[PDB]
């Protein structure tokens, strides 16, 4: 068996590292690529533990289409969609 909570925790940590590196390093192209894939797959945008850099990715169009507005970012947390994935929701 494998720990459901630990894997969720690691997947967040991986995402958080990709989110940070996509903005902090200009041409971390896989960092951007990974971040886009997560957003498009999980239907989300940034995380609430990185709201500052999240607004920066929102405006770089690495978040899903038709959802662009800083006001909405609080309800578009990927951390919550990662939780739901592994808990089957």
């Amino acid at each position, epitope marked *: 068996f494998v720990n459901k909570d630990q894997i969720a925790k690691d997947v967040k940590q991986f995402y958080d*590292q990709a989110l940070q590196q*996509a*903005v*902090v390093d200009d041409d971390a192209n896989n960092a951007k690529a990974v971040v886009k894939t997560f957003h498009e797959t999980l239907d989300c945008c940034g995380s609430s533990t*990185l709201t*500052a850099l999240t607004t*920066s*990715v929102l405006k*770089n169009n690495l978040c899903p289409s038709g959802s*662009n507005i800083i006001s909405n970012l609080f309800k578009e947390d990927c951390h919550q969609k990662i939780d739901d994935l592994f808990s089957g929701k």
Partner: single-chain antibody, 231 residues
Framework: DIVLTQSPASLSVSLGQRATISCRAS??????????MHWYQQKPGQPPKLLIK???YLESGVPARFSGSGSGTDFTLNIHPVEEEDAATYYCEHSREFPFTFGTGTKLEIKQVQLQQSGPELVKPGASVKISCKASGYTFSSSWMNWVKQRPGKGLEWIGR????????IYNGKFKGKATLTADKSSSTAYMQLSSLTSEDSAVYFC?????????????WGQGSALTVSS
């Protein structure tokens, strides 16, 4: 709000010679891979200048004698050998959460991008000003513009930042309602308007840009707009 506390208040060192400046934060400004504390150098008249980014990384152009270190809440700027032109006030600043905040400042005694702001402005209390910041040498419409306030003698105070593409902004709660940020993409010109002016608003207002990705670093500044409210 994260509160950055620098020490000493002011320092003086001989040409030699270790200059060491501390910076403490209310809570950790760091994640598992980065902080998120930065160091700016300001000389009188001039705007601030970015020296060390993300705790340790020297900005291109900055001498090797400048070095930074730290983690979590405690950070340190070091200068050695100290040289005559290193005389300035040094501000630490974080970019972990909103609002961004600067340290109280430390003065050091020794023993194609350009942003064109509008000129000085004198106005009655109760009035409104609109400061302009015309950008050139990069793609304005894909950039974030930040505004910083600095009262005579006092330190640096972050007002907010606006994305020029759609003019969606993030304000400091202290300036939200008083300062309005707008952008004219055709002009490549950022604007800040201040309302219900007071002697309290008498300050030099700077305009600062960020990198292509919108990394939360203040790369290029304007010369500043001295606003002075009086009767």
């Amino acid at each position: 709000d994260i509160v950055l506390t620098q020490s000493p208040a002011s320092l003086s060192v001989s040409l030699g010679q270790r200059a060491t400046i501390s910076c403490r934060a209310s809570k950790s400004v760091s994640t598992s891979i980065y902080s998120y504390m930065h160091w700016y150098q300001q000389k009188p008249g001039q705007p601030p200048k970015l020296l060390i980014k993300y705790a340790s990384y020297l900005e291109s152009g900055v001498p090797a004698r400048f070095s930074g270190s730290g983690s979590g809440t405690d950070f340190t700027l070091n200068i050695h050998p100290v040289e005559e032109e290193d005389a300035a006030t040094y501000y630490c600043e974080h970019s972990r959460e909103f609002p961004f905040t600067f340290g109280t400042g430390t003065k050091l005694e020794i023993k194609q991008v350009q942003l064109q702001q509008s000129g000085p402005e004198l106005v009655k209390p109760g009035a409104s000003v609109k400061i302009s910041c015309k950008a050139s040498g990069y793609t304005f419409s894909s950039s974030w513009m930040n505004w910083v306030k600095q009262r005579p003698g006092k330190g640096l105070e972050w007002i907010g930042r606006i994305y020029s593409g759609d003019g969606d902004a993030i304000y400091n709660g202290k300036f939200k309602g008083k300062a309005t940020l707008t952008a004219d993409k055709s002009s490549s010109t950022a604007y800040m308007q201040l309302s219900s002016l007071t002697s309290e608003d008498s300050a030099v207002y700077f305009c600062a840009r960020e990198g292509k990705t919108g990394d939360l670093l203040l790369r290029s500044w304007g010369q500043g707009s001295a606003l002075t409210v009086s009767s």
